[PDB]
Design a protein around this nucleic acid. Structure first.
Lengths: 329, 53
DNA sequence: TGGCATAGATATCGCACGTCTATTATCCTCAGCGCAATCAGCTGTGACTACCT
DNA sequence: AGGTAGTCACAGCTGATTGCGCTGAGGATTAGACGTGCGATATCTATGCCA
């Protein structure tokens, strides 16, 4: 029951739809109205809800009232909504039935044994002075565009490509993602995300060994399917969504054969700018992953960056980058 | 019409098939005769508004 | 002498081999909705001072 | 002259704000016909066979 692939609801034993298709307060298409009438008339023995953490929103909560079903079951990767709207969910659906131990599943090899790391990036003096000068929400651009952070990301990408690793780089900021991907000349996916070209890029990453570095915007959380990867580099995050980026880490890194015996077969890096507010976010966020026993070893400096030539070696380039960033306020 | 909540349908004229599928072809909107001139006035107003916008 | 088979001469209809435009329901785009950390104003609480006793 | 209510100066709570996601309307987008080529096939009659 989507707006693109339309099918007759009659005789449909299992009907699959989205919350928005049921949450449309505005007038729908005429056929959509008929299908909604059919759904409302029909009583469901089973209802299944995915990504339960999005349910507590008011529009999606109204969907439960809209639909009449006997058995409702919810599945997700996390259950800590940052707006603490979870107590109501205990009766929106019901009690938490089960929660597998992440470390135990790692031991059994059902999922990859992740190697987590937080990488601190020094701030350029001009960038840091500007960051201190600004006091409002506009500070996001400056530290997300740290030349040292760019150099660290470039070095990590080079090292893992030389290791022939699946590199997926997240960047919630639209502008930062564009600049990073373009300068590194790698595919980028953001708001537009033409679905055909989106799947084209995904298949290029999956099949072409020449291209194994995909830059993805915030849409990488739940807006599409993530092919199994091994190296996940997170540059910018929402700013305290302890469950969102933890879920992103869980979805990105999957079980891979070959290195099951080793305790570190999946590699995750979180780039954080030193002396910025971003640090306060990271410690705030990865707390959830700490609840699952995951550890994050601080890597102030990366070995090998000296010999390999990287971008922004001269500060004269870096001040031009500062020009570009400040141009967008 | 939907902005003014006026029931308006397409006017199925024929069939066109570019890649092998007979998509129905419509020429304008069928509306009730009662709101014909009101709809014309609304269209004129919205045309002027979108011009200045 | 005369009945008519037997093949020379010939199209003749059927099976098979070329094009052609449509006896009927697609593919991207912009406007309309939604979600999560600041920031600021409504309201509550303490410090300072007026008035009845 | 004496103390607690009115008034002003600051604090918690919550709604508005600003990045960002999703549908609905709207404008773009080779299968019987009609023949022939080839191939199997009915088709008509010379004329000399010997009774």
């Amino acid at each position: 029951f989507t707006s693109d692939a339309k099918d007759k609801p009659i005789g449909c034993s299992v009907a699959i739809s989205t919350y928005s298709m049921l949450g449309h307060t505005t007038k729908r298409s005429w056929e959509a109205e008929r299908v909604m009438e059919w759904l409302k008339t029909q009583e469901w023995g089973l209802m299944i809800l995915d990504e339960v953490h999005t349910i507590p929103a008011k529009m999606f909560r109204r969907v439960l009232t809209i639909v009449q079903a006997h058995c409702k079951l919810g599945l997700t990767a996390t259950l800590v909504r940052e707006d603490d709207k979870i107590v109501d969910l205990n009766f929106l659906i019901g009690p938490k039935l089960y929660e597998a131990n992440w470390m135990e599943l790692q031991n059994n090899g059902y999922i990859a044994k992740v190697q987590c790391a937080e990488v601190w990036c020094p701030m350029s003096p001009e960038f840091y002075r500007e960051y201190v000068a600004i006091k409002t929400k506009k500070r996001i651009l400056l530290y997300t565009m740290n030349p040292n952070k760019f150099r660290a990301c470039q070095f990590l990408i080079k090292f893992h490509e030389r290791r022939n690793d699946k590199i997926i780089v997240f960047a919630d900021n639209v502008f930062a993602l564009k600049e990073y991907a373009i300068r590194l000349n790698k595919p980028y996916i953001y708001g537009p995300t033409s679905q055909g070209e989106r799947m084209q890029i995904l298949q290029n990453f999956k099949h072409n060994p020449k291209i194994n570095t995909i830059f993805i915007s915030k849409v990488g959380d739940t807006s599409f399917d993530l092919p199994e990867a091994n190296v996940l580099i997170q540059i910018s995050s929402h700013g305290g969504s302890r469950r969102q980026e933890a879920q992103r880490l869980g979805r990105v890194l999957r079980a891979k054969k070959g290195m099951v015996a080793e305790e570190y077969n999946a590699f995750f890096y979180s780039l954080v700018s030193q002396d910025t507010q971003e640090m306060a976010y990271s410690t705030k966020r990865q707390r959830f992953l700490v609840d699952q026993g995951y550890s994050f070893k601080v890597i102030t400096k990366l070995a090998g960056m000296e010999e390999e030539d990287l971008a922004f070696s001269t500060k004269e380039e870096q001040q031009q980058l500062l020009q570009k960033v400040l141009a967008a306020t | 019409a939907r902005k003014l909540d006026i029931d308006c349908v397409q006017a199925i004229t024929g069939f066109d098939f570019h890649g092998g599928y007979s998509h129905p072809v419509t020429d304008g909107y069928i509306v009730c005769e009662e709101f014909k001139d009101v709809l014309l006035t609304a269209w004129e107003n919205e045309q002027a508004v979108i011009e200045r916008k």
